Amino acid sequence: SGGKKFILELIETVYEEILDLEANLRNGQQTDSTAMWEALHIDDSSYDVNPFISMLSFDKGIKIMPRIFNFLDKQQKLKILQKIFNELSHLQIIILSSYKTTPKPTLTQLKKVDLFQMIILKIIVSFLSNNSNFIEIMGLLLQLIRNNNVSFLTTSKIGLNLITILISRAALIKQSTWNEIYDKLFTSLESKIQLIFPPREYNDHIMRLQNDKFMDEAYIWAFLASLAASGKLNHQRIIIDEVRDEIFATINEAETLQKKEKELSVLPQRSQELDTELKSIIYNKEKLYQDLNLFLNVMGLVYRDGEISELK
């Protein structure tokens, strides 16, 4: 709770407040975002689940987020990011994007996940890059690690992608407290790193719904590239040991595509449809090499031409 009607009436209020601010601004009139900020209920603990968190369950709530950020200051935006991180596991979008809680998502559920990802992660990237200081990024990570089961978040594409954004920004911000925060994150992941890879039945289900024969796992390798990057030799050792089977599953998949390419390219007669198939195979074969190499290169390793070796 809730309830459903109350949250929908709250979104309508947010829409009304934003439209008044937008109208005032356009006409070059003085804007006051107090009524709008109060309509959000960020500083509200009167319910089991925070009303703003509940607003994010609805696509209409998600779509107005960039417009809300146009009328907020630095601290207000940070309060929003902190409420999101603090209650990540109680966000229905995380429950929908997790292969554990939602093993069979509907196409509608997948569209909601994708809408949320391109809107909410764009907002977070824009705020953290320009501009947020060390203490604030460290604070968001600690909020995420202390108020959530981190391994459950890594089973969700949004959860994993939110963690990658935070690690990658922290890695850029220092040219020693991060070293302690990173190890707290590593602690919560150790012996569960393989669980970031969804089971085959989940991937087969996502593929049927989108009519595709290849799963995009670039985000999984980007998370791993980031984690290995900020880790010491002992962390990299654990990562390699835990994801070893996934590295060899990706290589087998790429080598299967490499052989399909060679067998079809030798065919004397070639139509535009065989041309399309070969380009599709070449594209997917090269994508697997690139995704795995984003991770391996970080540890000075490279997959070429048929094996893994030290990067020159």
Binding site: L233, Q236, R237, I240, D241, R244, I247, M299, G300, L301, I308, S309, E310, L311
Partner: peptide
């Protein structure tokens, strides 16, 4: 070194299990 670390990681990765 970065070389010795990379070699340790390669050797670990190349183990069957």
């Amino acid at each position: 070194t970065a070389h010795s670390n990379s070699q340790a990681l390669l050797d670990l990765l190349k183990k069957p299990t």
